Amino acid sequence: TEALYQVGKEFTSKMDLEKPNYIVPDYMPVVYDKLPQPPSHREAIVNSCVFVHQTLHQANARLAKRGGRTMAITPRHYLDFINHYANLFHEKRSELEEQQMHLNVGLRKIKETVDQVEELRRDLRIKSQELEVKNAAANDKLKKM
Amino acid sequence: RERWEKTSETFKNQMSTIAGDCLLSAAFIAYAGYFDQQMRQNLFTTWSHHLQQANIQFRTDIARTEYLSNADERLRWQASSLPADDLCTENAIMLKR
Amino acid sequence: KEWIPRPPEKYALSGHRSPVTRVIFHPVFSVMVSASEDATIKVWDYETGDFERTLKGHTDSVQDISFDHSGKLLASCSADMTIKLWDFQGFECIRTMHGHDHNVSSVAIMPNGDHIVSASRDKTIKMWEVQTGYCVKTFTGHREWVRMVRPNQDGTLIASCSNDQTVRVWVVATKECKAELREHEHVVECISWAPESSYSSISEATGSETKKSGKPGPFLLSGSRDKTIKMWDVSTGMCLMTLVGHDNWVRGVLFHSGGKFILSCADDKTLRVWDYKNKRCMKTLNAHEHFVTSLDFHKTAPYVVTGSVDQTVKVWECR
Numbered sequence: 001t002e003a004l005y006q007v008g009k010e011f012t013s014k015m016d017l018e019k020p021n022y023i024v025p026d027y028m029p030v031v032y033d034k035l036p037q038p039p040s041h042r043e044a045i046v047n048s049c050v051f052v053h054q055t056l057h058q059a060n061a062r063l064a065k066r067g068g069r070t071m072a073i074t075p076r077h078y079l080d081f082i083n084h085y086a087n088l089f090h091e092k093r094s095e096l097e098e099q100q101m102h103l104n105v106g107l108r109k110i111k112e113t114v115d116q117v118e119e120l121r122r123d124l125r126i127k128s129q130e131l132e133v134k135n136a137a138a139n140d141k142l143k144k145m
Numbered sequence: 146r147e148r149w150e151k152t153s154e155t156f157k158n159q160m161s162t163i164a165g166d167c168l169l170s171a172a173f174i175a176y177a178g179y180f181d182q183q184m185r186q187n188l189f190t191t192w193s194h195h196l197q198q199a200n201i202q203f204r205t206d207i208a209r210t211e212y213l214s215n216a217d218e219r220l221r222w223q224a225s226s227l228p229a230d231d232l233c234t235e236n237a238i239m240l241k242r
Numbered sequence: 243k244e245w246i247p248r249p250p251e252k253y254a255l256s257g258h259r260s261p262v263t264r265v266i267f268h269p270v271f272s273v274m275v276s277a278s279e280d281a282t283i284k285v286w287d288y289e290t291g292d293f294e295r296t297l298k299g300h301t302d303s304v305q306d307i308s309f310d311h312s313g314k315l316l317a318s319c320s321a322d323m324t325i326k327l328w329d330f331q332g333f334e335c336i337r338t339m340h341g342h343d344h345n346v347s348s349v350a351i352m353p354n355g356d357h358i359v360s361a362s363r364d365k366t367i368k369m370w371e372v373q374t375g376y377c378v379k380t381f382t383g384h385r386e387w388v389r390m391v392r393p394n395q396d397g398t399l400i401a402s403c404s405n406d407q408t409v410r411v412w413v414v415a416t417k418e419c420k421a422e423l424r425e426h427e428h429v430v431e432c433i434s435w436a437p438e439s440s441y442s443s444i445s446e447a448t449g450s451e452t453k454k455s456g457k458p459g460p461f462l463l464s465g466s467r468d469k470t471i472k473m474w475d476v477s478t479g480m481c482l483m484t485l486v487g488h489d490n491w492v493r494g495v496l497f498h499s500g501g502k503f504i505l506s507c508a509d510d511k512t513l514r515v516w517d518y519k520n521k522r523c524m525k526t527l528n529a530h531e532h533f534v535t536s537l538d539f540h541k542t543a544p545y546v547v548t549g550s551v552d553q554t555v556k557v558w559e560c561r
Contacts, residue, residue: 017164
């Protein structure tokens with residue numbers, strides 16, 4: 001269990017895994033016996049990762065008791081789990097930033113569109129006011145006749 | 146603009162559950178490959194409960210198949226005579242990632 | 243050293259799709275980093291002018307970036323209400339830092355290499371921890387948008403400029419505005435302090451009298467939209483000289499590595515090199531076809547880098 005925890009800590013150090021407002025539950029499901037008593041968010045994530053690996057061992061034992069076919073659980077499975085965790089976290093976060101970037105630009109274009117639409121209201125009335133005086137002056141001069 | 150604003154305000158919430166969602170998704174790809182659907186759910190349920198007891202945020206509304214693949218990939222897979230099944234969809238995901 | 247930019251340019255790097263907001267020099271490596279408004283941070287090799295990579299972790303327009311003393315970590319601030327810390331070895335975001343409501347304007351790392359400061363529209367300055375990411379203390383007293391914030395050379399004194407025409411100097415331990423300066427005609431935008439290479443040059447260039455300790459005291463400089471550059475004394479709080487001649491708003495100011503001349507950029511589409519010692523050098527250099535946003539001076543290499551609105555970053559030789 002200690003070996004799994006140290007592998008998780010070292011490999012997941014690159015990822016953020018930081019929650020400043022993390023709340024420690026009263027009954028923490030402690031898997032790693034050497035986990036700090038007030039565990040951080042990063043430590044909690046690694047603790048869950050270790051628990052996931054030990055879950056498969058219990059699952060395989062359940063099949064053997066029932067008489068089903070079981071496959072060996074090896075550290076390579078744990079390495080695959082953390083590799084997938086690192087890749088999925090980077091992929092999901094990167095897509096979210098790109099998606100929100102495009103949405104932020106799109107909304108900015110919309111708010112500039114409505115602003116220019118309001119600008120057209122002021123342009124329209126200036127054109128209308130100029131038209132009213134133009135025909136009024138044209139009629140007045142055309143009537144000097 | 147209404148839909149984009151709604152998605153923009155929830156962006157902060159979505160970023161909070163990335164660690165929990167990815168952890169469940171990574172475990173499913175690496176571990177749940179060999180087992181049948183009956184225990185793929187059992188393994189997922191046990192992991193989800195542990196995250197809940199550890200106060201780790203994760204989205205419980207989206208399906209794992211929906212999370213790990215897009216509609217275009219699923220449509221392309223169906224064009225390759227992939228059966229329209231959740232377990233078959235999960236298997237195709239593991240054959241890609 | 244008499245390093246001076248020259249009208250001929252060397253490389254005109256244009257890879258940004260949005261106006262460039264700031265440019266910095268890597269402390270040790272031959273790396274020049276530029277931040278723009280397309281939420282991307284681009285890395286350049288100023289010696290050969292080759293685009294290296296981009297850091298697209300940010301959401302909205304990136305405002306200010308800063309390195310550390312060792313050049314190992316890169317701190318970034320953007321309009322997405324967050325501070326992002328970058329690991330420069332692998333070029334990934336290792337810690338995203340929230341809070342500090344609304345568009346964050348400036349960010350800097352004290353020479354301690356352990357704490358980070360930031361400024362935003364929320365009329366306050368927040369001090370953070372690089373290791374953990376928790377804002378232990380917050381600076382309040384500015385009544386408007388705080389634009390640009392710099393620390394000292396030993397992580398004890400911090401100056402911040404805001405739209406409220408006030409340049410307030412803060413203290414780490416006491417968290418009080420030791421000196422408040424409210425004398426600028428129009429909005430103050432950029433500030434920078436004085437390295438130890440220039441303290442001696444100020445004494446006889448202004449006639450200032452040494453105190454009982456004899457040390458001239460910490461020095462301040464503030465650039466404002468009123469087309470005036472004014473350098474200030476942190477210890478006392480009075481002016482020594484005002485630099486006038488910029489046609490438009492000034493956006494970036496800093497001291498020459500030798501601490502003898504003044505280099506600044508302004509919205510006048512030109513870069514002005516001014517001498518405060520004798521008012522002899524008033525070199526005005528056309529830099530960009532559009533507004534010039536920020537500039538930087540290499541500590542040892544004879545290179546200067548300027549960022550502009552025209553999506554182009556230029557590097558000038560120093561001779």
